[PDB]
Amino acid sequence: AQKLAEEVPMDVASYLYTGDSHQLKRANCSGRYELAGLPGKWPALASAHPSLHRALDTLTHATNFLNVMLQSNKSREQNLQDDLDWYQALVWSLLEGEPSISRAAITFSTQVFLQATREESRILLQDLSSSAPHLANATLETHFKWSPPYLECENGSYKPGWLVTLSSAIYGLLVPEFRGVMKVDINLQKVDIDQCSSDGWFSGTHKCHLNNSECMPIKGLGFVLGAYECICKAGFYHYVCLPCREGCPFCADDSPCFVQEDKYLRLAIISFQALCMLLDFVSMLVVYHFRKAKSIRASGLILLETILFGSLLLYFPVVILYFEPSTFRCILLRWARLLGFATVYGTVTLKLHRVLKVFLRVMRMLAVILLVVFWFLIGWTSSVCQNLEKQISLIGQGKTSDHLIFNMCLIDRWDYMTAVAEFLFLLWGVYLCYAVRTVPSAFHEPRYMAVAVHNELIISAIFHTIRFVLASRLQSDWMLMLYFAHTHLTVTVTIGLLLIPKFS
Amino acid sequence: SSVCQNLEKQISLIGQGKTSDHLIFNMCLIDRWDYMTAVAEFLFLLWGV
């Protein structure tokens, strides 16, 4: 409607859309404009500047004045002596009242009329029909007469200004009739208009509807189009308002907000991780086949398969942290860590305790610490889920280093003291191995395990250290190498020292 | 540690009251930890028994 309604006035669209001197400084008009529909629905001073009210006020004052005056009894029609002076001074003061009332006429015949227009400072006035006086439209009516914006031209180029008129028909004086027509016209061209108003002058926000849309319009200049600036709300800007590439505002570009990946790297990483877990399972089967010469008695078949189930319980964290951080990730992480940890190293150290008694009842020591670890997962798990899944803190976090973003599983002071557990439960065995210093068998099994223990203490301490130190400025790739590296190092090691000799 | 490093000042507290019908009463209170505490005491003395 409004869009198709723009193909209305040729050599005026510069005066309409640009509101420009192309249709004004040089464009043959030979006709005044007409807002009888080029306005809003009708605004009728319901969508009003105050100036409308001021104009109507002076109008109605003069209207009542002349009506009651003409309603004076015995209407003489005495236009001879001085009544002409009264009407002349009246129209002078009239057009002198409004600084933007350009021309105005007043006719009274119960063809000739008084008129005046602002030349520079005086009311260029003469007893001749001018400004406005529509006896024709008053007879057609046979209230006041609203009017239309215009242009300073009837058979000429439309000069500066677009003229909106106010007009009325002089009610006569014991009945009434049409006895005159008085009307003025003011410049409806320096009149601020609103394309994005809720209701205004034919407000159409046809530049920013929804697509990250806001209209932050150009408020008051005058009767000019293209005066409704729009804003591109939280996305890109290339009359283009666009989204972001992601839920990541400040999209001066539509660039991405995440780290660059190294997928090809990650494939082989995971494959090699499966390699080690394959070796784990495989060697468990190796055990359950070849169980009948020295190793079987000195080293429990049971206790071996314990350790391997440990390693297979253990290697998960890697395959985890290739995948994305959901909160359900982090918890499995804590699960696998502590379970593989205790389940292996308990049996390890207990063998040595038994050795030490031979110097001078296994599982009824081990199931204890497995118990305590069960308890722990439960306690901490519930204390985060039931009471912190929703309320206060967030675990899976989108943390940013510098330009980019990355998700990750986060920490808590809990896992600090957990690492410290690792410290001490090894350090026991370390005391153990040290003072048990010279003690025989055809294996140097104690030297083997003691090696494991010194290894893991120093090195798993380090791994936990270099994760907790600077996690808040990590990418999601350097970390993975860390996990891969330390777990392969220490634990493939601590497999091999036990398994290697027990073939040859 | 959980208290003294996270929820000391930031978001939560313990000095805390509820109401019977429309009247006030403050106290300390609980979370899941005291639950697990109890269950440990239980099992410990079970072994003793």
Curated annotation (Swiss-Prot), chain A:
Region of interest: Cache-like region: 15-162
Cytoplasmic topology ranges: 289-300, 434-447
Binding-site residues, glycine: 102-103, 152, 185
Effect of residue 150 to A: Nearly abolished glycine-binding and ability to inhibit the GTPase activator activity of RGS7
Entry's transmembrane regions: 267-288, 301-323, 328-350, 362-383, 413-433, 448-469, 479-500
Effect of residue 351 to E: Does not affect G protein alpha subunit activation
Quaternary structure and partners: Homodimer. Associates with the RGS7-GNB5 complex, promoting its localization to the cell membrane and regulating its GTPase activator activity. Interacts (via VCPWE motifs) with GNAO1. Interacts with GPC4. Interacts with EGFLAM.
Family: Belongs to the G-protein coupled receptor 3 family.
Domains (record comment): The Cache-like region shares similarity with the Cache domain, a well-known receptor for amino acids. It acts as a ligand-binding module that recognizes and binds glycine and taurine.
Protein name: Metabotropic glycine receptor
Residues of the full protein shown: 71 to 668 of 1215
